[PDB]
Design a protein around this nucleic acid. Structure first.
Lengths: 134, 158, 258
RNA sequence: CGCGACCUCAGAUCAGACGUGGCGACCCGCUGAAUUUAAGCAUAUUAGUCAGCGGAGGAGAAGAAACUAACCAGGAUUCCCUCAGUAACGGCGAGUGAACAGGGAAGAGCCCAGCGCCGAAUCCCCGCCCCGCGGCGGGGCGCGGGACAUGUGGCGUACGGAAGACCCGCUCCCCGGCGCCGCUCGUGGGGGGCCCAAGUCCUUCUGAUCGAGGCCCAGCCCGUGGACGGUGUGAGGCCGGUAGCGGCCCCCGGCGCGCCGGGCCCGGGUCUUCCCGGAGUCGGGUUGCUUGGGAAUGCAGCCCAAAGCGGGUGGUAAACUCCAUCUAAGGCUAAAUACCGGCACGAGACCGAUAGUCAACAAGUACCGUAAGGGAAAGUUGAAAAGAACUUUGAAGAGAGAGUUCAAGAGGGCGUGAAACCGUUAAGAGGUAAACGGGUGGGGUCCGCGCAGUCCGCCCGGUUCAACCCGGCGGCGGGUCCGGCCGU
RNA sequence: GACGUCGGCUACCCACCCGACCCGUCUUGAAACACGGACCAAGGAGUCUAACACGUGCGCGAGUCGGGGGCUCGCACGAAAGCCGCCGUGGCGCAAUGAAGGUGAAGGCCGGCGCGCUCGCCGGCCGAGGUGGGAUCCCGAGGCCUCUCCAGUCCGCCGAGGGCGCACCACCGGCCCGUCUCGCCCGCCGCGCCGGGGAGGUGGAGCACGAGCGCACGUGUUAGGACCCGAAAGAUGGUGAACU
RNA sequence: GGUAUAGGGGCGAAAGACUAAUCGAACCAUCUAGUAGCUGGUUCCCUCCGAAGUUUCCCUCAGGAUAGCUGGCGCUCUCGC
RNA sequence: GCGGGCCCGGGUGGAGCCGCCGCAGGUGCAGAUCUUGGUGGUAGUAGCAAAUAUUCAAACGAGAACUUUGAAGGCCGAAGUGGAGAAGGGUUCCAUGUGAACAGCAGUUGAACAUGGGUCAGUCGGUCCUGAGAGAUGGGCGAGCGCCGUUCCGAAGGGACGG
RNA sequence: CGACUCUUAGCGGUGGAUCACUCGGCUCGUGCGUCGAUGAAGAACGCAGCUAGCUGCGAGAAUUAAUGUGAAUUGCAGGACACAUUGAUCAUCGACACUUCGAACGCACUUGCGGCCCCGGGUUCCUCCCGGGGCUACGCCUGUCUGAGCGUCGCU
């Protein structure tokens, strides 16, 4: 349960917050889990997805072991477009079918100055929590 | 219209009472707020009693009761003078003082004087500064008890 | 309650006799859809509900302290008698003894895993097992009114003092923690059914006597309270009916129906 | 014949500040009815209420007795219970209607005029220097001005005060700056920002699982975390979060220690001598409103109009006589109190698009009236537009193929698609309008039989063990209460 | 009797015989030439608060109570629940009768002292009276018997008859308060325009060994919008001379 | 065309005529869900019992109160024992 | 199942629902000239009849009685069915394109729809002046918002020549 | 057997009823409890590449500066950015800015007429003219300056 009197735990308000959250909050919301190897190495459970990360689709019709590069992140649609998850329209042109980040696993991270520090902060907090538990 | 021996009654619901109905759905919240304020005041006055200033022994008018003894508004000036306590210093020490009370009988005066004597006997006066000046109690009876007194100080029992 | 201004915010006047309308207060003038429609009535569209709900309805009910003590004492008494507990749906088939008294080391527990291990060892884990299957979706508007999920009640746990037992028995679904001094009838008899499966600590079990007292001793924790007297002592009427004393003064029954 | 002071009175785009209006849920001061009741109606009731006007705050008002009581007395104001639907008011009808005391929430007391003492010892403005200046202060230097003797400041105010005598004990309170150590209760004060546990494990359905089964103990791991939401269904472990005296980085507040500049020579008790009271105000007559206040509770225009062992009150008018209780005509003050407006939150035995606010949507919007004002209707394709490429008839709207989708038997007002009503197919029938009840018959719709349905269920005739013993285990009942506990 | 034959009371259509006027309402009287009514879908009208009266259920019981407040929690479940020298300040009841000053519910028997004077004063005893009807309980002569005659304790059923007599009804008495009449005595800190007592009538919502308090439910009566809709009117504040 | 007279008011060669399609008292909002002894309506089934238009009083006569008719809850007793 | 109603079978539908023990209610419709919305008979019916009148040929166009052009016959007959304004409307004005909806038939047409363009001032008017009138300051009243009044209980010209 | 009419059933028409969903209401409770002449509430008019309405903004007009976060906004192009760079978008917002009416303030409300100073064009202060910048509303408090009185006075 939740005991803080300032948390909502209400269907209408939570849905309103989720569907009206700003762009920076939606960035955190659209987070995807890391692969087993990346999790073991960086000691990070999950990271927000980026524009050009390698990724595998886990759930859906496009389920497979292909490691496709993300093409873009449509945060207005709460979805991402990846390299080869696409379907042909009536006129033959291909269009990328959106895949939710929660149904996708990151295989390779795009490491930048901000990405490395986010990973370091998450690993440090994880280690501190584990030490407090021990 | 009356019907077969009903009580004759006159309800007072001829005004716009529905506009002035006062609900009590805020009663538990009000009780919680009062409790929080009381605890905050007690933490504010760390060594002072939670209840507050000492109250004198007082009897009741209206011969209906005529026997009950309750807490008074404050100690009378004559009672303070007999006890040898300055009226202004009593306020700073924590003695309730009101200047309107009279003193007709000697029994109440003597009882209040005895109560003041007992209060000064069991009063621990912290010094103004850490280095104890005159009239300040010894540090021996300061570390043992630096806590508040729950309930009224020296409660009155009939 | 509903808003007091509901329905009467409009300014409607009734068209008198001489027109095909049915003498209903209708909206005055305008070039809109809501013009000469009908308002201020319970049967009209929009309108105002008959007898609007008011906030000062007598929501709360007062119950006598002695009656509440009687009810909670009856619930504690019916916590025994495994027939009632089983009929209440609690699976206590493997419980070694229904007045399940456990040591005081449970208060020292601070881990839900330790709590689960204790429940499994005491064989009360089947009730939580049943609660897990009982987890389901509620029917009706409760889903959209913050009551979406429902589940059965698990075994209650009574503790003398909180030393971490509440923290340990908190993530297990259905478990309700109760202090002996602050027992709740609404949790001891959920739904008005007197049966309940409870797990006591040694200190709480011993403090029950100091809380309620026996028939020949006052409570000593409640100022003036004693256990209610029995209307009849020998409750087993089957034993009474076939006793020699009664049967010695009975006529021969007639079962030769004509 | 002018100049120089003062009192009254004007001009300034003189120097520096202030008020105007809005909101108005709560509050304060006025004005203020009628529908209604009385089964009519005029006093009454609705009602100091609606409407109207003015004025502020986060609360406002009130507030420390010209009090309550008659008791062995209590002792500011405000709020709750009770007093109490009581005393009392009322065509004594309908109806109206307190207060004292008691128990609680809170609790804090004070300051002037006058009387008097001090060399006006007081205050405001302008110039310079130092600190500091985003709620313009402190000190110093100015024969620089002004206000004030038609009274500023210190002591001092009803609980007495002041001045001397000489008994007692002794020497800290506050303001303006410069810094410093402890992150200061929801258990780290307030605000912001970033993070912290565990299966997408093996089969099986589906369009998609979040479904079902199993996985060293109901099952695998976490659990101080099994709230919630999203994700192609019903997810503790996919994600955000949730729990936590969990972690990190900033800003602000107060509580505490050091330094500078200062202001500050600040008491209690006994005795002696003096002093001490707000006027067109109280009060009386009056009339109008109001009140439970009734030979007048309160507020008032008018007239009369004071006194000081005086004045007010003591719920029946007056006179005499003792009592009890306060000190009006001056002022300040948080707390418990109210909050349908404003900012930000939490919650529901509430309604779920003719319901809930008028307004779930480009709602006080469209629109109507010259105007004050009146005021709607209107949610849902799909998991994903993947929103029907292309061929063909037609000018086109519209179709026929083909295609996407699990599903268009979901095709842009598209989820589910009922009734009234209509078109078409199939059957039946038809000159007393149609329709209905009771009783049959005929024809159809399918339903249950059957390629006989003679439905079985017990007793009797035509591969091992009960019967009977041995060993072990478990259960029931019983008395010599046998022995011990238990128990009235 | 069994591969185009069976059973389907009910529901689909049709035919026949009998019966059969359209619903709701006002009304003595409706099918009415009385009123509302084309059809369908959604909404739609005895609610809530307060005061009572009665009945029922529960708890306690000459007591009963939680109103308000306080102590436990940071509210998930909780604005819940537990507790209070507050346990009772306070409400109801345990005492009523008068306008009020006020008063205020028990008697009887026995012995004695005054003249037993239907009156007063001293001690002991019984301690809510009596009659009639009273559900139930007690005694109960005796009878019924038992394979034979007697004796005979036991388990019985009936049991005439005789009693203690719940609750309740009728009546007779008794007691408390107000009032009327006739009357005789008591007490003193203050001997009076003092206080108290008796008998006989009468008025009271009274006593006569109690029954109330809290909660919940049902019905009825009211004040509130008051089962729903409906006026002709009245008042307050604003807008209109673009028509006339 | 401009202007003045605004609702118990204006204006009227006077018709109770006009005052924004309304005038023997205009329009908008509020009191207001004003009151009605008077119309109309008043939502599922089964079972049991089951009425009155009569008494007297009321500025009472289309209505109430009071008895009467009725239902429910029981209670005290007698017995084909 | 007397009955209120309920349990199965089939078809559509795609995401929540129900049984029992108790509690609570904004809990059951045939009517109220009931409120909202939709649909019928009437009914392809009444009607598309006020102010004399149209005809021929061609063009565009898929489509012609209503458009355009040419010709013929007519009416308004200079107080007009003409040419310009004021109030009022506000893009209705112009060109091109379309025929989804409107022009109670139709339309290739329109004041419809979609695109683009358009109003040029010392001399034409507002601006200036005052008329009937309205309305501040001074003053008075008013509980108050404000009202009375425009010379009335005003120290009412801040202007000018010369020195 | 026709046509029309009546009933029932399948399918197909108008209609959006029922059910399931809900970024919305209603009610209760908690904390805070803040407008304005340094220009409030409200109104008008403008601002996007394509922009009508809502919302946001004010000629710096779909937002400027700074802080936090860290790779987007998106209906299409354009693209700025090197996301090893204060650096795209968002939130915070403490700096800057904030058109015209409106208590609304030079007089009136037509968007018309002005006055007192300064600057630039024009000038060589030369008064016109043009443009820009600051003041010019009422009541009232303290102080300052200039004034009136056959008001009270003292000298000449």
């Amino acid at each position: 349960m939740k005991f803080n009197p300032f948390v909502t735990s209400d269907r209408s308000k939570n849905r309103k917050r989720h569907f009206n959250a700003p762009s920076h909050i939606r960035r955190k919301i659209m987070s995807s889990p890391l692969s087993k190897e990346l999790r073991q190495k960086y000691n990070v459970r999950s990271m927000p997805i980026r524009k050009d990360d390698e990724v595998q689709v886990v759930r859906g019709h496009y389920k497979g072991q292909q490691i496709g590069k993300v093409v873009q992140v449509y945060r207005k649609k709460y979805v991402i477009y990846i390299e080869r998850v696409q379907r042909e329209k009536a006129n033959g042109t291909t269009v990328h079918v959106g895949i939710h980040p929660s149904k996708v696993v990151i295989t390779r991270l795009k490491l930048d100055k901000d990405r490395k520090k986010i990973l370091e902060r998450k690993a440090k907090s994880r280690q501190v929590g584990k030490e407090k538990g021990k | 219209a009356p019907s077969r021996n009903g009580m004759i009654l006159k309800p007072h619901f001829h005004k716009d009472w529905q506009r002035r109905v006062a609900t009590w759905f805020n009663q538990p919240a009000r009780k919680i707020r009062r409790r929080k304020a009381r605890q905050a005041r007690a933490r504010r006055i760390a060594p002072r009693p939670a209840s507050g200033p000492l109250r004198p022994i007082v009897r009741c008018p209206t011969v209906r009761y005529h026997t009950k003894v309750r807490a008074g508004r404050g100690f009378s000036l004559e009672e303070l003078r007999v006890a040898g306590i300055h009226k202004k210093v009593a306020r700073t020490i924590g003695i309730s003082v009101d200047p309107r009370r009279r003193n007709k009988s000697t029994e109440s005066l003597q009882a209040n004087v005895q109560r003041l004597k007992e209060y000064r006997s069991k009063l621990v006066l912290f010094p103004r500064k850490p280095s104890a000046p005159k009239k300040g109690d010894s540090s021996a009876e300061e570390l043992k008890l630096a806590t508040q007194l729950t309930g009224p100080v020296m409660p009155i029992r009939n | 309650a509903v808003s007091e201004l509901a329905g009467h915010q409009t300014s409607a006047e009734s068209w008198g006799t001489g027109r095909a309308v049915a003498r209903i207060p209708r909206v005055r003038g305008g070039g809109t859809h809501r013009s000469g429609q009908g308002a201020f009535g319970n049967m009209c569209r929009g309108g105002r509900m008959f007898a609007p709900t008011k906030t000062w309805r007598r929501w709360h009910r007062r119950v006598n302290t002695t009656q509440k003590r009687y009810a909670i004492c009856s619930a504690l008494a019916a916590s025994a008698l495994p027939a009632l507990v089983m009929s209440k749906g609690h699976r206590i088939e493997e419980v070694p003894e229904l007045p399940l008294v456990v040591e005081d080391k449970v208060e020292g527990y601070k881990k839900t895993k330790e709590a689960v291990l204790l429940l499994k060892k005491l064989k009360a884990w089947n009730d939580i097992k049943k609660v897990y299957a009982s987890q389901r979706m509620r029917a009706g508007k409760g889903k959209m009114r913050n009551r979406r999920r429902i589940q059965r009640r698990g075994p209650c746990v009574i503790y003398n003092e909180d030393n971490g037992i509440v923290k340990a028995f908190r993530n297990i679904p259905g478990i309700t923690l109760l202090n002996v001094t602050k027992l709740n009838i609404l949790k001891l008899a959920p739904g008005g059914h007197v049966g309940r499966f409870c797990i006591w600590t040694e200190s709480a079990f011993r403090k029950l006597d100091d809380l309620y007292g026996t028939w020949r001793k006052a409570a000593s924790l409640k100022s003036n309270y004693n256990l209610p007297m029995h209307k009849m002592l020998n409750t087993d009427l089957s034993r009474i009916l076939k006793s020699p004393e009664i049967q010695r003064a009975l006529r021969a029954p007639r079962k030769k129906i004509h």
